[PDB]
Design a protein around this ligand. Sequence first.
Ligand code: HEM
Ligand SMILES: C[C@@H](c1nc(-c2ccc(C#N)cc2)cs1)[C@](O)(Cn1cncn1)c1cc(F)ccc1F
Length: 413
Amino acid sequence: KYGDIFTMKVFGQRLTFLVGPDAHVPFFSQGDAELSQDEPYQFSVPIFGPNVVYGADLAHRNQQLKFIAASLSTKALQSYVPLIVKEAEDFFAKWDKSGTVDIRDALAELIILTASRCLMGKEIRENLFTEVAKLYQTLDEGLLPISVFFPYLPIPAHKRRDEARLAMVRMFKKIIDERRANPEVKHNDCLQVFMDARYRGEEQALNDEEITGLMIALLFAGQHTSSVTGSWTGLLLFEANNKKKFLPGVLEEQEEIRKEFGDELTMEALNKMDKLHRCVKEALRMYPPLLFVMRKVIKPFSYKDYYVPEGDTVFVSPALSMRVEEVFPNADQYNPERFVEEDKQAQKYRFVGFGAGRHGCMGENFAYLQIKTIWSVLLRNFDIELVGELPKPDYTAMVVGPAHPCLLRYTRK
Ligand code: HEM
Ligand SMILES: C[C@@H](c1nc(-c2ccc(C#N)cc2)cs1)[C@](O)(Cn1cncn1)c1cc(F)ccc1F
């Protein structure tokens, strides 16, 4: 090894990792001509679709990111937040006087519910959820670690996936054709943002696949990440170790705001919950949901005295580059308040769990707001104690959340 950087050769290709905040500089800051996403992420293509995201050429690609970006902008966010909150308050109402809950599975149910209404609209969410929660998890199920190198191996799962996507397109066929018949009616969701999107040089719009694809992707990104970091934020907090040292800090801020921005719950009020923003952010720092992020190298680049040829595949791990102790004092242990003047730091790419650069996470705030809302509600309506100790990371999966007896128990407030 070096400490900072280390290539392997595995199967065919050779994987050049980076860990340094200096290291990251080439991974997070060169451009689309210099690093490619095409090859490394090509596993997703026939989960999302043809000419969707990584499916499409560079021209049609950069624009779809933009439609997503604008679908998830501060504007559109402010308008989802109402939906996000209500669902949260609606979900946690249903709970008992007192009882156990697998916080992973519960917040997974709850985020997909809200992922439905913001991404696919009222009709999908009100009429068709249980259908579209199957048609998703059938696409999901066609993601095996084989799929990441042969994403078209004729194996039975891939068929079922390809099949389930086709079906989901025809579902939005109906819903979009309905809407294109009454332009009159205004619409608050992503798919509307997409429906109204058009490319440069052409004014026919995106179609009932391309759209559906674009939305599924955001379904994917939601379920594979928010869902877990949601759970981590709380598993860590309500471990007793940390409940003592941090939970007063927390609930004080829950009251301090409560008496200013009311019993009801609005974005203004989330945006300034600066503690819980950190108390979540630290659960990304310690247990990022994506293990690592990849590019094939196009224009080659030296790093120090280490040459990184062409056809390489440069990695960065969140989980690795955020346990560096020359960058995070006390990295082994759960310190929400580290960010209070870490966030004051100048050097780029010290925190990478939401990546950085040209391709940093277009969902960052959506995630936060979804997540903060969940605990924001859960703190006010319950008292939350952990059963067992802090769950172990679960690498036996494509998704990388906490191991599956990862539960709490609630008693009403
Ligand atoms: C805690 C939750 C999440 C985490 C940790 C996370 C993390 C990341 C990271 C690390 C990247 C960079 C990946 C790369 O370099 O290729 C990224 C990109 C992205 N994320 Fe997320 N993400 C989260 C949630 C979401 C959600 C909920 C959405 C959408 C609803 C979303 C949409 C995206 C998109 C569109 C990009 C691509 C930007 C591009 O390729 O130019 N993410 N995310
Ligand atoms: C492109 C998507 C990514 N997949 C990985 C990845 C996952 C598992 C392995 C393995 N083995 C290797 C790489 C890193 S980034 C993703 O980056 C992921 N995402 C972003 N925010 C939330 N999840 C992605 C990007 C999108 F633009 C849309 C959907 C989507 F899942």
